[PDB]
Amino acid sequence: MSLQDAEWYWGDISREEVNEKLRDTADGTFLVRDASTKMHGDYTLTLRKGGNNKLIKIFHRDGKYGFSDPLTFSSVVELINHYRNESLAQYNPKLDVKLLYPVSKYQQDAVGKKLHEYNTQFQEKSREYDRLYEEYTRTSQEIQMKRTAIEAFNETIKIFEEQCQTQERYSKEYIEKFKREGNEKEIQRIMHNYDKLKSRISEIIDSRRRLEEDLKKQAAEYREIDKRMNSIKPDLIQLRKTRDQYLMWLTQ
Amino acid sequence: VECLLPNGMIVTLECLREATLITIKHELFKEARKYPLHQLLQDESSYIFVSVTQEAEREEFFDETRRLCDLRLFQPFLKVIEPVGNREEKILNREIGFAIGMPVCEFDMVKDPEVQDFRRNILNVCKEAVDLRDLNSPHSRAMYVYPPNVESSPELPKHIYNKLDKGQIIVVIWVIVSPNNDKQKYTLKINHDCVPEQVIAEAIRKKTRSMLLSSEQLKLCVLEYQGKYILKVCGCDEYFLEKYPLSQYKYIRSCIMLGRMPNLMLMAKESLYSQLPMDCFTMPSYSSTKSLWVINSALRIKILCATYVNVNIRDIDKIYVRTGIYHGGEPLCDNVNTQRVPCSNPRWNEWLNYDIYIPDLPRAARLCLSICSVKGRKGAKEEHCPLAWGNINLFDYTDTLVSGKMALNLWPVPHGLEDLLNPIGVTGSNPNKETPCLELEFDWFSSVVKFPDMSVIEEHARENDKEQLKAISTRDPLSEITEQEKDFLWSHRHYCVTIPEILPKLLLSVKWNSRDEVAQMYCLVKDWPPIKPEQAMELLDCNYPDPMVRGFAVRCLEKYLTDDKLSQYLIQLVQVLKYEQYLDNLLVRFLLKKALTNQRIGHFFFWHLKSEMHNKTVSQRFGLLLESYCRACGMYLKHLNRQVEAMEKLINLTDILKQEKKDETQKVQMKFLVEQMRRPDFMDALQGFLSPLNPAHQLGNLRLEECRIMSSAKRPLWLNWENPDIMSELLFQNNEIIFKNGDDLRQDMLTLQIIRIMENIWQNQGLDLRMLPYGCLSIGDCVGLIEVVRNSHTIMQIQCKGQFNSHTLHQWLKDKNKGEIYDAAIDLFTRSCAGYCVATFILGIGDRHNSNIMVKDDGQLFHIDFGHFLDHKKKKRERVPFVLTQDFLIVISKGAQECTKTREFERFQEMCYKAYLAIRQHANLFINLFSMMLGSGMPELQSFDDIAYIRKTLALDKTEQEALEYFMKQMNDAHHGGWTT
């Protein structure tokens, strides 16, 4: 029944380990710490309510404990057990939560050799993720370069195509007078103009189509890399968590 | 080159690389005479060249004086049309587009009303600043382009004061007296508090005492030459144009601190007023509600569907959309998750219900959501990960609650972000397509819902106490505050006004998800006593998103923040522009007005916004800000363009060198480099422009015989320029900068900034610990410049001058400082080593080795490689990166090999302790600096968990005596038992 043996009493862990342990957990889950100030004395009760980790000081005085000046409770374990069955609203109506789900420290349910494998396995699994990410960023920006080139090829066609309209508009005045004059030489020169313009447009569009096909292939590879990263990442996180757990075990 | 003539004719011209557009146009209209339609063409003066540039934006070439290769064409084709549009406006627009790196015409295409309102409303700031800079022309313009580089506090530190001879400083003044540049020295002793006018007067006294002028004649001469001349620093474009005490100018104070003699040139002010032109700013061409507090309903949001979700259906089990209403980093209510659905069909059509009531939604609330996946292994072994994220502001820039359906493109989760929601990230839809698009629907209440106009609706919904309030006041910003202290602070919210620096703590005691408490907090803030700028910057972090809190902070800054401190804290102040909900806010107006009235501020404002234009999250925000600035910076757009051209050419050269020349050896790489540099258009671009690191430094001709590629990682490019100033010999003739491509320099910049801050506070403390925060500037994506420290040698380069003995560094230092100067060299070495030990322990800088620890001939030590800090080694006890091997103690102990007996080492330890305590006393400033860099996207710190490191090295949770004991414990443990006493 001593506090050191309580499931929810973690000792002198940091506020960041508390945030890690309580992240996205259900409301009412809690753990009791030794105060951030190392000096022997008050504890801190950190419980999750409304998506936040509320911090409640446990004032120690004359051998008694409590959340307020009266300080009637005999021990921290007895205080928490009292509030494990009673809502905190009796102390502070600001929050109506109850101490429901203590974050047990007994969930731990050759070790050096095994830790070596996890350190190696995580290290190479990480290298996979960073390699993909740098390959992901490279393809992400390269896709942007090829996507703006398609925007540039679209404009170029707009100007070339606009020229066809001007040539169509103006060629009529020349074509009719030459036809009634019999000047086939200038007529065929204008036809050669048409031929040159159309050939250049065709070259432009062929390069644009090759660029579009290359862009589509690049985007498919980009999505493949993205899926690879999304598949690796959960295993990376799980491996890091297990490696840290084993390291903590060995450090005991 | 194929040219599209206006009459439908198309002609191919054999143009050359360097041909200008006037020449090309004349040649084309000469060539067109071969073709049938030539008879219907007008004079070539009536048409201009149009084409498509590599940016993909059609460009009209009004500036026909440009060269062909300079056009940045997409394909070798030219279009000819009659000119349409305003000439000067279009050339200015293309200048701005080149400077900020994206076309200005893009911003005219975004249909977002917030953007179109921002870029039209910011022009008020630009016009106000432009009117300011012309109030006292031509002196005011000279103050704009050459702002005084003065300290904040006129009073000298007493240790600095004692350097002077009875309170008088000896100054040598130079006068150019002959057309052949005859130089005359006037060694002049003056009071350290004389303004430039009396220094001018004394210099004229010495200049004219020889003619034995009468008292009246002498007075008339002195008065005449007071209004004719100004003082300039010899060797750089730094001027003393304002009546500050001479010792307040950073140049003179650095001269006292270093013991040097100031060198000032007695320039005539007519030359100054002539060398700065009248460049002007002009207006660009583009220039049923119900109260939220009557809704009486709960907040709910529908998640319709998602697309383009990239997850292997075989690997993950199911996906869901996690959501939450956030105020800053504070959830206003418990997070809500959608039902898990197979990734084959991400469709939910589910109303998510939130505990928050609509009337109790704070103005700065935002919906944060993300798509997550479930790896459902054996129940409790289940693991979740985020696929993409995005944030939505509940209220838009015009105070309107979002309603109806909307589509949001989700950003990729930032590298290393394990959390399922990214509330610290920016709000807005991802501009990149082929990205997960999440469809949302917000409830509709029969009319648009506006946040109440609080101007009128704010009417609507013991000694131990003082000691406790003071104690909470002195606690650092990131200290944990329990619920009891939160209720006590709110209980005594009215008595907290007597201690104004309790506002940051009292704001975190508010129930931001409660209407009644927030109304009272707003009523308090408008009556709050202003607080110091070092504290008002804490209210600009992500933790304080309320427009009222941030408005109070911005008013405090604009009241008490000096231009010296503004330039000292510009990195952070531009980083916190990302945390603003809307484009048009008060912080942006403050920074823009300050940048448009001081070119020293504007230079780094531009280069800090420009350095993150590659980031798509902020690209639009910083691009609009940069366009607004560049439209109103006046003449400086020319020098900014020159610097941009130079950095672009260097970027291309290094990109080539590491993409195709990477495999080749050093000799041939240098051959390629020298071949490329000598070309005419690399010569023209890389010569004759202001230094990006320091706009006061001109970069003249290149010393190609000194430019080389170093052996450092990724082969940085080491340049070397002349100093074109006629007095360069007195400052330096060599301006050398290291151009790094492929190294992330925006954490090294922060490390050097913090070293500068802490050196400044130590000097003000009376501790003469010398730190060398050399210049550094990140100019793009992992590309930046690094100032080269003259006469510096890495400790490896000194050990190489041999097996080198332990005393090699001490022997070298003793040989470089023969005689009586030896003692000063050792003392400066000791002070620099102590300062850097303290700084690197506090900051957790990357590990230190001989190749990244420098040392000058002067004796000063300093560090160069600041790649990692705040101990990024967690992915593998806080460690001391800098250890004093015997090679350093032997120097500090003046050649006696004893490690922990000598007096000098004890005094060095005393310096270490006093410096550490001095930092620990100002820990709030450094915590505020780090906590304002969280949106910067550096891996080293993405959340307040990373800033918990400095709280540990500074030992803020312990007693000051216990913090001392902790520091000695760490030093002793790392240095093998020499620090226990």
Side-chain angles (χ1 to χ4, degrees):
Chain A
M1 199 101 100
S2 64
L3 177 61
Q4 155 152 46
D5 297 356
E7 308 100 308
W8 35 259
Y9 170 68
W10 276 91
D12 188 73
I13 62 169
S14 64
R15 167 154 40 107
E16 327 299 350
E17 254 163 306
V18 156
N19 288 331
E20 184 266 295
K21 280 166 166 61
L22 294 176
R23 216 191 302 284
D24 307 304
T25 59
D27 287 7
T29 188
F30 77 98
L31 64 162
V32 176
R33 291 199 290 132
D34 201 5
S36 56
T37 61
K38 279 274 189 163
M39 93 303 263
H40 183 279
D42 299 355
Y43 295 94
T44 58
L45 163 69
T46 169
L47 71 100
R48 198 160 179 90
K49 198 277 193 284
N52 289 270
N53 299 332
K54 331 301 277 193
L55 258 163
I56 319 300
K57 198 70 165 278
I58 292 156
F59 303 116
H60 171 61
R61 281 212 272 273
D62 302 348
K64 268 191 190 213
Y65 301 87
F67 300 144
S68 58
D69 40 326
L71 283 208
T72 89
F73 296 95
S74 302
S75 184
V76 182
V77 301
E78 189 301 345
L79 158 67
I80 262 53
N81 290 349
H82 179 280
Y83 282 109
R84 275 259 288 276
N85 287 40
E86 300 298 336
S87 175
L88 271 282
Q90 171 255 282
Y91 150 50
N92 177 4
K94 186 185 188 183
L95 48 90
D96 59 339
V97 86
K98 183 173 169 180
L99 301 186
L100 299 175
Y101 312 122
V103 173
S104 177
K105 75 204 193 198
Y106 294 126
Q107 296 299 29
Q108 301 315 57
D109 297 350
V111 73
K113 213 286 185 175
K114 188 151 293 251
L115 182 139
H116 159 296
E117 179 262 24
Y118 274 83
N119 278 350
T120 308
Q121 195 164 337
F122 172 65
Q123 188 273 333
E124 87 89 6
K125 191 57 60 75
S126 100
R127 170 214 58 68
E128 191 85 336
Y129 188 72
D130 312 66
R131 194 221 83 204
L132 286 166
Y133 193 82
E134 67 180 43
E135 183 174 13
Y136 175 87
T137 43
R138 191 203 82 218
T139 311
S140 185
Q141 63 193 36
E142 185 189 315
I143 279 286
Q144 185 53 234
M145 302 183 4
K146 265 203 278 306
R147 264 196 222 274
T148 178
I150 291 296
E151 209 215 305
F153 266 111
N154 272 274
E155 286 300 311
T156 313
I157 292 158
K158 212 79 72 174
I159 330 171
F160 268 89
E161 288 286 355
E162 172 71 353
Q163 183 97 101
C164 296
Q165 198 67 347
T166 88
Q167 208 274 25
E168 287 163 21
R169 176 185 284 274
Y170 287 5
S171 57
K172 184 185 288 290
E173 303 302 329
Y174 302 86
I175 197 66
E176 291 300 327
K177 288 188 177 182
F178 296 165
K179 186 62 160 65
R180 71 180 294 168
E181 175 62 10
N183 189 347
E184 90 304 340
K185 177 258 178 179
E186 284 311 71
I187 293 168
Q188 62 77 15
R189 271 320 322 263
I190 294 170
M191 278 195 192
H192 207 322
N193 261 345
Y194 256 132
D195 277 27
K196 282 291 194 79
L197 187 58
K198 264 55 170 64
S199 59
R200 296 301 303 155
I201 286 165
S202 85
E203 203 299 273
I204 272 183
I205 289 181
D206 289 354
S207 303
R208 182 193 162 171
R209 276 203 248 90
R210 165 160 39 264
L211 177 52
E212 283 188 347
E213 289 163 9
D214 208 273
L215 168 58
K216 266 178 70 280
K217 273 47 153 143
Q218 187 61 288
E221 146 163 335
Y222 184 50
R223 291 186 91 197
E224 181 200 318
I225 297 300
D226 180 359
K227 289 195 285 189
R228 299 250 316 282
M229 261 184 327
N230 291 333
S231 180
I232 289 290
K233 169 166 43 176
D235 321 284
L236 188 69
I237 305 170
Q238 182 270 15
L239 224 59
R240 147 151 45 82
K241 185 183 289 178
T242 302
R243 179 270 291 250
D244 297 347
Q245 191 280 336
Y246 278 125
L247 175 59
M248 167 247 171
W249 184 337
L250 176 65
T251 304
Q252 78 84 7
Chain B
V1 152
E2 59 201 310
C3 305
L4 285 100
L5 304 187
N7 285 14
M9 182 75 215
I10 166 155
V11 181
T12 53
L13 270 206
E14 170 38 297
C15 303
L16 50 91
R17 215 153 243 119
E18 300 300 327
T20 58
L21 273 61
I22 291 159
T23 308
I24 299 166
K25 189 166 73 178
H26 185 76
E27 287 185 301
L28 177 63
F29 275 75
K30 170 59 172 183
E31 175 39 35
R33 302 171 199 191
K34 274 91 167 190
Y35 303 101
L37 318 187
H38 75 50
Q39 188 166 13
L40 285 301
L41 278 294
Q42 298 154 295
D43 297 353
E44 78 297 325
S45 56
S46 306
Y47 312 98
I48 84 188
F49 282 173
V50 188
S51 94
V52 169
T53 36
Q54 305 235 306
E55 286 337 302
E57 286 296 307
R58 192 199 76 262
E59 163 64 356
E60 274 182 83
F61 301 122
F62 283 107
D63 191 6
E64 307 206 293
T65 74
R66 205 145 44 141
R67 289 157 41 250
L68 175 158
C69 96
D70 206 20
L71 287 179
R72 193 57 55 41
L73 291 188
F74 185 59
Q75 303 285 258
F77 87 110
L78 284 209
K79 169 68 163 162
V80 176
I81 61 170
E82 317 215 286
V84 292
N86 184 271
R87 277 257 298 91
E88 55 272 5
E89 191 27 79
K90 267 87 181 43
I91 43 185
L92 173 58
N93 276 354
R94 81 95 188 147
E95 280 161 46
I96 295 170
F98 184 88
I100 81 184
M102 80 186 71
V104 165
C105 62
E106 288 185 346
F107 298 122
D108 296 345
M109 299 166 19
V110 300
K111 302 261 63 175
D112 189 13
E114 182 180 355
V115 170
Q116 301 307 324
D117 279 342
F118 168 66
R119 72 198 297 255
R120 162 188 286 86
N121 275 285
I122 200 67
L123 306 179
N124 267 11
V125 181
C126 294
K127 199 146 69 178
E128 263 142 41
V130 167
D131 279 39
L132 255 287
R133 80 167 66 128
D134 286 355
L135 213 30
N136 186 23
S137 178
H139 175 235
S140 59
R141 198 160 44 273
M143 305 271 330
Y144 167 49
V145 308
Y146 305 122
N149 200 11
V150 294
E151 299 277 12
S152 292
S153 300
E155 241 307 2
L156 288 116
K158 194 63 176 285
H159 77 299
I160 273 170
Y161 179 103
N162 290 340
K163 320 247 210 212
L164 297 172
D165 174 29
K166 307 176 195 81
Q168 299 197 321
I169 181 58
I170 184 46
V171 170
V172 61
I173 271 164
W174 295 84
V175 190
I176 286 74
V177 294
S178 308
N180 71 290
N181 206 354
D182 285 337
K183 276 180 207 122
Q184 299 269 6
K185 289 179 74 181
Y186 290 151
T187 303
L188 201 64
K189 150 182 289 233
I190 46 167
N191 314 356
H192 70 190
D193 40 64
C194 259
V195 300
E197 171 247 319
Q198 292 119 332
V199 184
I200 296 284
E202 291 299 335
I204 295 332
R205 207 65 38 61
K206 286 208 180 1
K207 200 192 74 164
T208 60
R209 62 183 177 165
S210 305
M211 317 69 147
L212 308 174
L213 301 177
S214 180
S215 306
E216 183 73 353
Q217 303 294 349
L218 189 62
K219 284 169 183 289
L220 261 57
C221 159
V222 166
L223 263 290
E224 172 59 16
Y225 298 153
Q226 274 181 334
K228 182 173 175 178
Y229 297 81
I230 55 163
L231 297 172
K232 195 195 94 169
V233 175
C234 280
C236 67
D237 267 35
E238 192 173 340
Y239 297 77
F240 305 166
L241 300 182
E242 173 64 50
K243 310 186 194 293
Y244 283 73
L246 200 79
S247 70
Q248 195 169 342
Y249 278 95
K250 299 194 81 213
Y251 179 48
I252 282 85
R253 201 171 279 195
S254 309
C255 282
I256 320 187
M257 188 249 183
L258 292 151
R260 303 178 72 127
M261 311 225 321
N263 280 259
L264 310 180
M265 207 214 325
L266 190 69
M267 170 177 291
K269 85 202 304 178
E270 319 309 357
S271 176
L272 192 96
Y273 297 174
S274 179
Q275 60 150 309
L276 45 90
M278 150 99 75
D279 284 350
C280 61
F281 159 93
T282 55
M283 281 285 121
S285 192
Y286 64 71
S287 187
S288 64
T289 54
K290 66 169 60 181
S291 176
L292 177 76
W293 283 2
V294 86
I295 300 305
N296 301 327
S297 183
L299 184 69
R300 56 177 192 151
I301 288 131
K302 203 181 191 177
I303 309 302
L304 286 94
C305 59
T307 68
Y308 282 130
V309 178
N310 292 322
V311 75
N312 211 354
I313 292 162
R314 278 69 63 119
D315 251 24
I316 70 145
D317 198 22
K318 292 193 178 177
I319 57 159
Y320 61 92
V321 162
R322 165 147 263 231
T323 74
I325 314 300
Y326 276 72
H327 191 272
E330 177 217 329
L332 297 180
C333 48
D334 196 5
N335 291 339
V336 189
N337 300 334
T338 62
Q339 296 300 341
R340 282 92 167 280
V341 294
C343 25
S344 312
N345 179 44
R347 200 145 272 110
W348 297 280
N349 279 4
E350 180 184 352
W351 276 108
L352 300 187
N353 277 273
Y354 301 94
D355 226 27
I356 189 74
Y357 265 64
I358 285 178
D360 297 351
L361 276 163
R363 173 55 200 269
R366 72 230 283 258
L367 171 66
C368 301
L369 36 69
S370 70
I371 297 172
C372 281
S373 62
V374 181
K375 185 62 161 174
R377 293 301 310 289
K378 303 190 75 173
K381 262 65 70 169
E382 173 171 308
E383 291 278 321
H384 305 178
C385 299
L387 272 45
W389 65 270
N391 305 346
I392 309 91
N393 286 310
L394 264 298
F395 305 88
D396 71 357
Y397 77 109
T398 185
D399 317 329
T400 287
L401 187 73
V402 295
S403 67
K405 193 177 174 182
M406 98 171 41
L408 174 85
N409 301 311
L410 304 176
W411 301 85
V413 48
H415 194 347
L417 183 102
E418 198 281 283
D419 209 9
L420 302 195
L421 286 179
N422 195 41
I424 278 194
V426 301
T427 44
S429 188
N430 189 345
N432 165 29
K433 307 305 193 180
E434 194 58 20
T435 57
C437 181
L438 186 67
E439 284 164 46
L440 314 161
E441 183 176 13
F442 295 83
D443 212 339
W444 165 266
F445 307 106
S446 83
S447 75
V448 68
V449 172
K450 280 268 192 327
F451 197 92
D453 181 11
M454 254 312 258
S455 185
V456 175
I457 307 330
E458 89 195 346
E459 178 88 6
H460 293 55
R462 286 286 180 80
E463 75 296 332
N464 54 340
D465 300 343
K466 282 119 189 93
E467 197 287 338
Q468 199 73 250
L469 284 167
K470 218 47 199 153
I472 302 151
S473 202
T474 63
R475 278 200 231 300
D476 73 278
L478 260 54
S479 176
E480 78 206 20
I481 190 170
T482 63
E483 287 301 317
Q484 284 104 325
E485 315 218 301
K486 287 185 198 165
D487 316 285
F488 170 71
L489 273 164
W490 194 251
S491 303
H492 290 86
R493 62 184 171 281
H494 293 293
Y495 299 80
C496 274
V497 162
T498 86
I499 89 167
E501 83 259 6
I502 196 62
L503 184 64
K505 300 296 186 183
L506 180 61
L507 286 169
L508 300 178
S509 154
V510 190
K511 287 282 291 291
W512 287 107
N513 61 8
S514 153
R515 162 167 57 138
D516 322 280
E517 294 198 5
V518 172
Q520 290 174 85
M521 194 71 241
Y522 286 172
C523 207
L524 274 158
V525 166
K526 55 86 166 175
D527 267 20
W528 207 263
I531 70 178
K532 281 199 198 123
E534 142 173 355
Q535 299 159 0
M537 302 219 329
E538 147 163 20
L539 304 181
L540 291 172
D541 317 340
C542 42
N543 284 352
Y544 306 95
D546 194 275
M548 239 45 54
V549 170
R550 297 178 88 80
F552 166 86
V554 168
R555 285 203 295 273
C556 270
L557 292 190
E558 87 187 23
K559 267 44 140 165
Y560 288 113
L561 191 68
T562 64
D563 291 16
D564 165 32
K565 289 290 158 264
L566 204 177
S567 53
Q568 181 158 78
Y569 301 137
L570 190 48
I571 302 173
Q572 285 78 25
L573 286 168
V574 301
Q575 284 294 339
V576 302
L577 277 169
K578 307 179 182 171
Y579 303 145
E580 306 299 324
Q581 287 184 283
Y582 316 132
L583 297 178
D584 193 348
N585 63 70
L586 289 174
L587 176 62
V588 86
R589 293 180 172 258
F590 168 68
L591 291 183
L592 193 74
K593 176 170 283 190
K594 284 287 187 180
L596 293 172
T597 50
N598 177 317
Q599 273 198 3
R600 179 169 47 71
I601 287 166
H603 172 89
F604 291 101
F605 185 70
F606 171 95
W607 272 113
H608 285 145
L609 298 178
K610 180 71 160 59
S611 78
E612 319 229 359
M613 208 70 18
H614 66 88
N615 195 332
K616 311 302 319 175
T617 60
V618 298
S619 194
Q620 179 171 65
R621 172 190 288 288
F622 289 2
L624 291 155
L625 192 49
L626 276 181
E627 183 225 334
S628 302
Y629 167 65
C630 292
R631 200 168 292 279
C633 75
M635 75 175 214
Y636 201 54
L637 191 54
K638 257 77 79 162
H639 310 69
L640 287 172
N641 264 276
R642 282 237 50 173
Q643 292 158 61
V644 173
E645 298 162 12
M647 308 282 84
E648 220 73 32
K649 297 212 86 74
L650 285 170
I651 285 163
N652 296 358
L653 182 54
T654 31
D655 276 357
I656 288 160
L657 218 77
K658 79 190 208 243
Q659 90 184 17
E660 51 192 81
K661 305 291 101 184
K662 34 158 185 45
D663 300 329
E664 314 192 8
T665 187
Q666 177 69 356
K667 180 67 71 172
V668 63
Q669 227 158 32
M670 272 279 315
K671 182 175 263 91
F672 174 76
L673 185 91
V674 78
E675 265 43 59
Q676 288 281 292
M677 296 189 99
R678 57 179 250 297
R679 305 185 317 71
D681 203 22
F682 184 104
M683 284 327 249
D684 283 339
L686 266 290
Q687 300 183 129
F689 63 109
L690 275 49
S691 178
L693 287 173
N694 189 337
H697 288 177
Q698 312 242 48
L699 300 175
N701 282 357
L702 270 166
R703 282 207 184 78
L704 277 305
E705 61 274 5
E706 325 284 338
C707 298
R708 44 103 156 191
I709 49 189
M710 336 185 56
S711 305
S712 314
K714 290 161 287 193
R715 333 209 65 61
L717 214 161
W718 168 301
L719 287 321
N720 191 313
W721 289 269
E722 320 310 23
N723 181 350
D725 198 69
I726 45 170
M727 290 300 341
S728 50
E729 76 260 20
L730 302 180
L731 209 84
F732 51 75
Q733 309 98 324
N734 310 322
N735 212 313
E736 332 187 82
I737 306 174
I738 286 151
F739 185 84
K740 265 182 179 281
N741 188 354
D743 269 339
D744 195 33
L745 259 54
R746 78 206 192 291
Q747 76 260 321
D748 196 339
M749 203 183 354
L750 173 66
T751 286
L752 291 162
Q753 188 212 16
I754 282 140
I755 282 164
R756 186 216 308 141
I757 306 313
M758 87 176 30
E759 189 221 352
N760 148 73
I761 83 184
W762 284 338
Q763 293 297 343
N764 278 271
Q765 199 97 346
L767 273 156
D768 197 29
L769 302 191
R770 217 87 85 63
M771 310 286 265
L772 192 145
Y774 55 84
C776 186
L777 183 66
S778 187
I779 64 181
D781 190 14
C782 312
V783 62
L785 302 154
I786 286 166
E787 179 196 348
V788 167
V789 179
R790 262 147 280 296
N791 289 83
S792 316
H793 302 64
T794 61
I795 291 287
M796 74 166 243
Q797 284 173 15
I798 285 152
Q799 255 78 37
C800 264
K801 275 127 181 193
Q803 176 53 47
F804 48 80
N805 193 310
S806 184
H807 295 206
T808 281
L809 178 60
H810 163 263
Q811 252 298 357
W812 180 83
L813 218 43
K814 156 158 296 307
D815 287 341
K816 292 296 194 181
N817 303 114
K818 305 284 197 176
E820 195 270 334
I821 171 60
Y822 173 53
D823 285 283
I826 295 292
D827 195 62
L828 177 47
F829 184 88
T830 302
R831 297 196 322 269
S832 52
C833 201
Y836 265 103
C837 280
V838 170
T840 66
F841 168 68
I842 283 168
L843 297 174
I845 294 302
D847 278 9
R848 247 57 218 134
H849 55 287
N850 293 341
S851 310
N852 65 359
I853 279 160
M854 295 277 259
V855 66
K856 289 162 65 85
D857 282 277
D858 184 29
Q860 216 201 96
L861 196 96
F862 70 102
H863 300 181
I864 46 161
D865 166 339
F866 300 122
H868 312 282
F869 76 134
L870 294 184
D871 191 37
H872 223 66
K873 326 320 179 262
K874 330 286 222 329
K875 67 191 174 76
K876 294 207 299 179
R877 196 203 295 166
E878 70 289 344
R879 52 88 164 82
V880 309
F882 182 18
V883 196
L884 260 77
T885 36
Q886 276 311 51
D887 43 44
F888 282 32
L889 300 172
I890 195 74
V891 180
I892 283 158
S893 146
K894 275 203 225 291
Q897 72 283 352
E898 307 205 59
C899 64
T900 184
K901 329 325 316 193
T902 88
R903 173 288 192 151
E904 294 93 351
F905 188 39
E906 299 184 7
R907 172 200 38 101
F908 164 80
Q909 286 177 11
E910 257 184 89
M911 306 183 187
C912 287
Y913 300 153
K914 289 167 61 177
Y916 173 62
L917 291 209
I919 305 302
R920 186 195 139 92
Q921 272 162 22
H922 297 79
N924 292 2
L925 172 55
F926 303 114
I927 283 162
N928 290 342
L929 291 185
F930 283 141
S931 52
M932 276 157 81
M933 301 301 290
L934 297 184
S936 62
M938 296 174 240
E940 301 125 326
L941 67 175
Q942 298 206 120
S943 67
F944 292 97
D945 177 327
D946 322 278
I947 304 169
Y949 184 85
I950 183 154
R951 298 196 72 261
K952 198 186 186 194
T953 56
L954 294 175
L956 302 181
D957 48 310
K958 307 217 289 171
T959 305
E960 186 147 293
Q961 195 59 221
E962 245 308 336
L964 206 43
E965 269 78 63
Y966 164 71
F967 181 89
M968 325 171 27
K969 173 67 158 58
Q970 288 286 14
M971 287 293 146
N972 185 87
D973 300 358
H975 300 32
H976 296 327
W979 293 59
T980 307
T981 183

